[PDB]
Amino acid sequence: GDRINTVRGPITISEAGFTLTHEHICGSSAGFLRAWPEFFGSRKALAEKAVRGLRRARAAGVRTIVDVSTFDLGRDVSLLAEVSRAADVHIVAATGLWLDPPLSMRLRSVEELTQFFLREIQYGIEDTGIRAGIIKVATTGKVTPFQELVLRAAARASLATGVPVTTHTAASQRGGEQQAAIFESEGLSPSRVCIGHSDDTDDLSYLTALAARGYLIGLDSIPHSAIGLEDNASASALLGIRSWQTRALLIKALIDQGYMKQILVSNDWLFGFSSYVTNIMDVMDSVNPDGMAFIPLRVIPFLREKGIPQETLAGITVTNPARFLSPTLR
Amino acid sequence: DRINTVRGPITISEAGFTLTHEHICGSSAGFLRAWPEFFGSRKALAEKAVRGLRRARAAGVRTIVDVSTFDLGRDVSLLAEVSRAADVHIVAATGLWLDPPLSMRLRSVEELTQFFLREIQYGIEDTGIRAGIIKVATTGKVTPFQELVLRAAARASLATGVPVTTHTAASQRGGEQQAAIFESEGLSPSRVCIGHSDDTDDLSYLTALAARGYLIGLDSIPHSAIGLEDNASASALLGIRSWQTRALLIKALIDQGYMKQILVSNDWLFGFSSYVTNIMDVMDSVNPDGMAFIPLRVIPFLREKGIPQETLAGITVTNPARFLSPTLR
Ligand SMILES: C[As](C)(=O)[O-]
Ligand SMILES: C[As](C)(=O)[O-]
Ligand SMILES: [Zn+2]
Ligand SMILES: [Zn+2]
Ligand SMILES: [Zn+2]
Ligand SMILES: [Zn+2]
Numbered sequence: 229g230d231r232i233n234t235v236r237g238p239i240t241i242s243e244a245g246f247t248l249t250h251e252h253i254c255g256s257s258a259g260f261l262r263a264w265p266e267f268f269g270s271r272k273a274l275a276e277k278a279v280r281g282l283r284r285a286r287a288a289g290v291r292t293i294v295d296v297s298t299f300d301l302g303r304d305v306s307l308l309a310e311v312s313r314a315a316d317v318h319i320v321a322a323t324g325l326w327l328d329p330p331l332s333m334r335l336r337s338v339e340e341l342t343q344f345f346l347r348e349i350q351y352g353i354e355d356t357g358i359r360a361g362i363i364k365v366a367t368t369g370k371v372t373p374f375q376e377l378v379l380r381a382a383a384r385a386s387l388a389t390g391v392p393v394t395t396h397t398a399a400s401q402r403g404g405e406q407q408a409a410i411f412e413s414e415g416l417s418p419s420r421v422c423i424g425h426s427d428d429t430d431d432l433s434y435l436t437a438l439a440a441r442g443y444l445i446g447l448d449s450i451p452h453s454a455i456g457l458e459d460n461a462s463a464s465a466l467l468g469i470r471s472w473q474t475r476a477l478l479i480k481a482l483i484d485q486g487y488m489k490q491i492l493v494s495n496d497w498l499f500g501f502s503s504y505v506t507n508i509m510d511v512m513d514s515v516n517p518d519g520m521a522f523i524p525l526r527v528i529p530f531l532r533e534k535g536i537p538q539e540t541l542a543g544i545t546v547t548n549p550a551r552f553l554s555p556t557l558r
Numbered sequence: 559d560r561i562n563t564v565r566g567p568i569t570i571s572e573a574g575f576t577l578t579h580e581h582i583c584g585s586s587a588g589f590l591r592a593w594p595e596f597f598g599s600r601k602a603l604a605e606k607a608v609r610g611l612r613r614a615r616a617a618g619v620r621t622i623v624d625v626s627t628f629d630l631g632r633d634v635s636l637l638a639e640v641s642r643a644a645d646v647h648i649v650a651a652t653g654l655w656l657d658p659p660l661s662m663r664l665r666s667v668e669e670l671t672q673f674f675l676r677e678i679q680y681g682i683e684d685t686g687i688r689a690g691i692i693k694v695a696t697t698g699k700v701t702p703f704q705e706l707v708l709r710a711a712a713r714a715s716l717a718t719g720v721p722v723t724t725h726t727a728a729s730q731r732g733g734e735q736q737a738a739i740f741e742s743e744g745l746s747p748s749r750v751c752i753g754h755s756d757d758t759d760d761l762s763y764l765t766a767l768a769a770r771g772y773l774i775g776l777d778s779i780p781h782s783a784i785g786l787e788d789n790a791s792a793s794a795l796l797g798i799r800s801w802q803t804r805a806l807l808i809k810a811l812i813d814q815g816y817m818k819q820i821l822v823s824n825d826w827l828f829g830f831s832s833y834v835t836n837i838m839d840v841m842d843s844v845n846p847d848g849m850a851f852i853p854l855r856v857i858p859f860l861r862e863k864g865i866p867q868e869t870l871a872g873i874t875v876t877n878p879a880r881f882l883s884p885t886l887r
Contacts, residue, residue: 257659259587262683263628264673267661299592302661328660330586332596332631332831340835344593354591502661506669 232553233349233361233391234292235309235319244318245291247549250394250424250448250494251520253278253295253311253319255501256302257328268500275311278499281519282315288524292318292549294494296364296394296424300328301503305358320553323348323385324364325378326396328503334374341381349389361553363393369401376410383414390555392420394446399428404438418442420556422492425449427475428468432485439482439490444552447482448494450475450527451516462505467515476527479544480534491544492552495522561882562690563621563647564638573647574620576878579723579753579777579823580849582607582624582640582648584830585631586657597829604640607828610848611644617853621647623823623882625693625723628677629657630832634687649882652677652714653693654707655725657832663703670710678718690882695725700735708736712743719884723751723775728758733767747771751821751881754778756804757797761814768811768819773881776811777823779804779856780845791834796844805856808873809863820873821881824851 231238254261254274265271285293297303305321312319323345325333336344348360363382367375382393393411397403404423411421423438424446439445452475454460454467482491497520501509518525523545531541560567583590583603594600614622626632634650641648652674654662665673677689692711696704711722722740726732733752740750752767753775768774781804783789783796811820826849830838847854857870 257587257661258589258592259628259631260659260661263587264661264676266672266676267669299588300659302588302659330589330629330631330659330832331657332586332589332593335832335834337835343595347593347595503659503664505664506666 230554232320232555233359235305235312235321235358239318241550241554244550244553246289246524246545247292247294247553248285248290248494248520248523249294249422249492249549249552250296250446250496251293252297252301252496252498253308254302254304255297255498255503257503258300258302258330260302260502261304261307267502271307274500275307278311279314281499282311282317285520285524286315286317288521290317290520290524292320293520294320294322294362296322296362298322298324298326298364300330300333301326305353305356309356309358320361321353321358322362322364323353323360324382326364326366329374338377338380341377342384345381345385346388349385349391360391362391364396365393366396367403367407369398369403371406371410379407379410380414383411383416386416386420387414388558390557392422392552394422395424397423397425399426402431402434404434404443408438408441408443417557422446422552427478430474430478432481435478435482436485436487439487443490444492444548445482445487445490446492446494447475447479448492449496450493451495451497451518451522453515457511457515460511462508463511466504466508467512472526473530476530479531480536483536483540488540488543489548492548493523493527493544495520497522559883561649562688564634564641564650564687565647568647570879570883573879573882575618575853575874576621576623576882577614577619577823577849577852578623578751578821578878578881579625579775579825580622581626581630581825581827582637583631583633584626584827584832586832587628587631587659589631589831590633590636596831603829604636607640608643610828611640611646614849615644615646617850619646619849619853621649621878622849623649623651623691625651625691627651627653627655627693629659629662630655634682634685638685638687649690650682650687651691651693652689653711655693655695656697658703667706667709670706671713674710674714675717678714678720690720692720692722693725694722696732696736697727698730698732700739705739708739709743712740712745715745715749716743719886721749721751721881724753726752726754728755731760731763733763733772737767737770737772749885751775756807759803761807761810764807764811765814765816768816772819773821773877774811774816774819775821775823776804776807777821778825779822780824780826780847780851782844786840789840791837792840795833795837801855802859805859808860809865812865812869817869817872818877821877822852822856822873824849826851
């Protein structure tokens with residue numbers, strides 16, 4: 229129906245407002261924030277940095293973010309709840325698995341993984357009672373056997389609960405096509421799926437064909453760019469060397485092709501990032517001081533100046549996330 | 559003179575009969591708290607561990623060293639709970655095993671050193687419980703990241719006096735590469751136990767390590783898949799040699815004059831999610847004695863082979879005390 233799970237409890241979807249559909253409070257690893265908080269200075273410092281950042285995003289018009297950190301990205305839902313409340317910004321938590329499953333996950337069957345995802349959606353995450361409102365999955369270009377289990381478990385959990393699925397792709401590898409085939413083999417509707425990191429490629433043929441099938445297209449890393457940082461290999465590898473404008477122009481491109489309803493936009497920002505090289509967070513913040521406010525402050529005016537009507541931009545940042553997040557079918 | 563446990567410091571005289579390589583639960587970081595139903599429930603797992611420790615205690619055991627690291631899903635709050643209920647001392651570990659997540663795998667030796675030091679000097683998580691041992695693991699030749707872990711472990715040991723204990727593939731003589739790295743760092747072999755050393759019959763490999771002053775961890779004695787050789791996963795994990803065959807290594811090293819260098823354990827667990835489903839049931843049917851296997855089966859087996867009480871007490875009480883007591887000499 230029209231209620232979704234947030235880390236402060238259930239809300240009606242009209243309350244979500246401007247929603248960033250792919251963000252992170254902290255990109256980490258299972259257990260890591262609690263075992264080694266000084267990696268982030270302190271847990272308090274991290275929380276305060278996130279509260280400041282979310283408050284700025286709120287001032288810029290953001291009302292909800294979707295934290296697509298899974299278990300193996302070190303999702304700490306107690307932290308998400310703390311910062312959501314202090315910033316007074318809705319946060320939707322995720323279940324699923326990303327690219328770093330530990331052995332206790334890697335060795336599980338599709339049936340076992342289905343029950344883990346269902347636990348996090350239907351019962352709660354850890355002992356917090358906080359329930360996930362979305363399932364996040366990730367694959368390499370060519371889907372591994374384990375990753376295929378994860379996608380099937382995600383599809384089964386979605387069909388059982390109605391909560392949507394969102395993905396990490398290598399867009400230069402057209403990763404969404406293999407994901408989509410697996411999802412549809414499970415009877416999952418494309419309208420319950422966002423193919424993410426789709427702004428990492430300029431292949432409009434790939435993008436429009438997925439959109440034509442009813443998939444949501446995640447243009448979710450707009451401010452990611454290492455232009456000017458070419459001498460930094462780790463930052464280049466992570467952020468790419470296409471401009472944020474180049475990424476943003478894909479939003480216009482899909483609108484022009486008639487697929488405004490299939491677009492979801494985000495920053496894929498974080499306030500801490502331990503699952504990459506040390507100090508990457510400082511590099512990212514030096515490139516994009518706006519953080520999660522980058523979409524409303526820079527991208528929206530960029531799009532309006534290009535001639536895209538207000539109603540279309542509002543449709544993308546409010547209506548599309550609302551349809552996507554509302555639990556649908558069963 | 560003082561050893562840190564999950565209930566606080568104890569004097570070496572308090573440690574008594576100590577099992578130096580054990581696990582309450584072999585898991586993954588965050589896993590027990592994210593999916594306790596994998597083990598039935600957290601309560602079920604705790605209760606199994608308390609009964610298990612009480613059985614070990616009734617067989618004479620007074621302390622175990624839980625060598626579960628961060629990435630083996632060590633939950634020291636669980637360790638504290640079961641230690642208290644069973645009245646058995648538990649020494650917690652820092653270090654890294656074979657499943658480091660990205661947030662660990664991407665770290666420098668300097669960063670890893672600070673993490674190991676934090677868990678020894680400050681406490682684990684926000685519990686104030688301090689590690690009393692550093693556990694490391696290698697495969698084969700030693701990977702570049704594993705080398706960083708071993709060096710970080712040596713540096714944390716050298717700063718604190720806390721000993722290092724290892725996981726090897728003994729069939730690949732893996733202790734040799736570990737020893738080389740430790741010695742390059744200035745670490746005394748008397749601070750190092752080369753573990754899973756009972757997984758080979760190469761006595762020349764073992765005695766040579768002992769002769770250099772390493773402790774030899776004969777720590778997986780009941781691990782055997784005899785009869786289960788058509789169970790591939792059990793066979794790869796548990797091996798095809800009998801427990802008597804493993805146990806005879808203890809006698810062999812004593813007869814070579816190295817009783818002071820021997821540490822014995824079960825390497826048991828009460829839950830095990832970082833392997834195939836139902837492995838705990840397979841393991842429990844193979845060794846229904848659990849952590850009581852060493853005192854109930856191995857000690858009488860050695861006594862019947864003519865090893866005197868004084869020697870067995872030196873191995874199970876004196877050697878662990880000397881090893882665990884923090885020392886920079
Ligand atoms: C945590 As990411 C760089 O896959 O959005
Ligand atoms: C957790 As193990 C089988 O390396 O002792
Ligand atoms: Zn991603
Ligand atoms: Zn992301
Ligand atoms: Zn081991
Ligand atoms: Zn072990």
